[PDB]
């Protein structure tokens, strides 16, 4: 069976939904861990060597740890677009605020279901290319999976319409909501823009607090994959309660709510809608 490697639990989850049990999947970044700067383990390095097909997010996700993914994929002598593929190829890339080049991209594409579908299309493409036997299975799973996602996106484009503008702000630690914001029309603020930066300096915190004091935002959120101290601080300083943990860089641990791309997207939608209705 096809030996596949996903860099993180999101891509891995999407992959499972395409490949079912037709492949040997290994997911590098453990659930709940930050996929921006990860130190691949020996099993990770071995599985990547043996892999027929490696999926990563690209658009500047796995290029901290000073390019851990690049170095992973160097050492394993793998070739871009032959052995490994960025599953974000195709997304309308959004860039980080201020800096603006290759390495100014914001990686968080998947917080837009349409992009989640693009990922699935890319994942399915490559699975088929590399394992033509199961081409049909994949495409069938794909069509089903993207329907599931598309429905959900279709249903959610409205969720936020009734939120009073001055409450309508998603606040999370990392600025991982740019795509979400664009897709569902709810602005987002944050303590640090991307996890590769210092995380939760008194300055970032002050900046966010001062922005928040100007709002009537009822709830802050905190992602499942970051230290929550900084946001607790924001919470305390603005007296805005942290309403829910949500999912940016990772799906939930096995069995919890949100433990798949689809249901983490569903969870986020729901919790944020409730959180901001409060
Ligand atoms: Mn992130």
Numbering used by the authors: 32 to 309
Authors' text:
PsaA is the solute-binding protein (SBP) of a manganese-specific ABC permease encoded by the psaBCA locus. Mn(II) acquisition, mediated by PsaA, is important for S. pneumoniae growth, proliferation and virulence. Intriguingly, both Mn(II) and Zn(II) are acquired by SBPs belonging to the Cluster A-1 family of prokaryotic transporters. Studies from our laboratory have previously demonstrated that the pneumococcal surface antigen A (PsaA) from S. pneumoniae has a clear interaction with Zn(II) despite not being involved in its uptake, which occurs via a distinct Zn(II) ATP-binding cassette (ABC) permease.
The crystal structure of PsaA had previously been determined with Zn(II) tetrahedrally coordinated by the four metal-binding residues (His67, His139, Glu205 and Asp280) but no structure for the Mn(II)-loaded protein has been reported. Well-defined and continuous electron density was observed for the active site residues that tetrahedrally coordinated the metal ion, which was identified as Mn(II) (see Text S2 for further details). The tetrahedral coordination of Mn(II) is analogous to Zn(II) coordination in PsaA and the structures of other Cluster A-1 SBPs (Treponema pallidum TroA, Synechocystis 6803 MntC, Synechocystis 6803 ZnuA and E. coli ZnuA). Metal ion discrimination within the Cluster A-1 SBPs is proposed to occur through subtle differences in the binding sites, Zn(II)-binding being favoured by the presence of three N ligands (from His residues), and Mn(II)-binding being favoured by two N (His) and two O (Asp or Glu) ligands. However, the preference of PsaA for Mn(II) is the result of the highly unfavourable entropic contribution of Zn(II) binding (−TΔS = 9.5±0.4 kcal.mol−1) relative to Mn(II) (−TΔS =  −4.0±0.9 kcal.mol−1). Furthermore, consistent with the lack of solvent access to the binding site in the metal loaded-PsaA structures, we observed that Zn(II) could not be extracted from PsaA by chelating agents, despite the protein's lower affinity for the metal, or by competition with Mn(II).
